[PDB]
Amino acid sequence: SMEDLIPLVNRLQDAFSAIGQNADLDLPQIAVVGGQSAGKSSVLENFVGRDFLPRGSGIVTRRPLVLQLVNATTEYAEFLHCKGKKFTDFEEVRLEIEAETDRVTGTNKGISPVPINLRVYSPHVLNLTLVDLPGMTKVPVGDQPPDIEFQIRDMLMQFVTKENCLILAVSPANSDLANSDALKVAKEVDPQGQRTIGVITKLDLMDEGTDARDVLENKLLPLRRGYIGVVNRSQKDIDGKKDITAALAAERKFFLSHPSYRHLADRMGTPYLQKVLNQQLTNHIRDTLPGLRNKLQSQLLSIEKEVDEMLRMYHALKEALSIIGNINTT
């Protein structure tokens, strides 16, 4: 259903344009959340299919980045704060985004609440909103204040409460697993797990002697989709510019030994997480379409029976209805 939905959504916007109405589908946004240093950027960029999110040492997501994807013929990017700037090199794009974060916070443990605004045009995407958010913490590191936790936490909470927010729930191993920022937020919005996949990352770095075994066996609090684990890029990995395919290879090794996950091994990996999330998205789009269709029918009728000599309506309305119908049938 995702595959057939994509083209129909663009077509629907065009019909709306002709009516001269401000009518949009308002595609739901997806937000990635997780502890400090979680691999948050890695997860998000893997879904998008591109290297464009800054990654570094220590604190990585240091400013929220609100990216709106725009269907367009040419492939390029532009910043709100950099009016008119033309790249054309996607490796350069990545670099520029990273640079802007350094601009305000430096690379010495950072933080700023001011969003970076980026528009990435592509002809193979939904007009979506994705958000990279600062890592929530429990104890201060570097020069961060004692109340670091409370500043960061608030910031990301404004995005994840939005109805229909696919949560990329990343959970850091350097914090207690039961105290998981990811699992907390994920459970709050979508308790039954139609679109929540509980993901525990960085599993190879967990402190000796702790585990979430009952929860992770899908028995303690059973979820329809269960839990899928992943092992993303480590500190050495990010430092080196280790590329996307490589990161997946490290995952395999850990999972064979961990008691809480070996029986569920066939329902593990990044790739499996991908499949589930897409399905939910489609549902929202369709639901809004019946309402419009009906309005259009009513307007036409009146003038026709008294034929007002305002025959211009006839043609405009007819067009809109056809587009709507096709999406409704799927």
């Binding site: 003038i303 008294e306 034929v307 007002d308 000599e309 305002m310």
Partner: peptide
């Protein structure tokens, strides 16, 4: 009332009668 009934006679003045614009 009786005069008001008289307008109905002309069929081909039908569509010619109707417009409401």
């Amino acid at each position: 009332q009786k005069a008001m009934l008289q307008l109905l006679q002309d069929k081909d003045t039908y569509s010619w009668l109707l417009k409401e614009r």
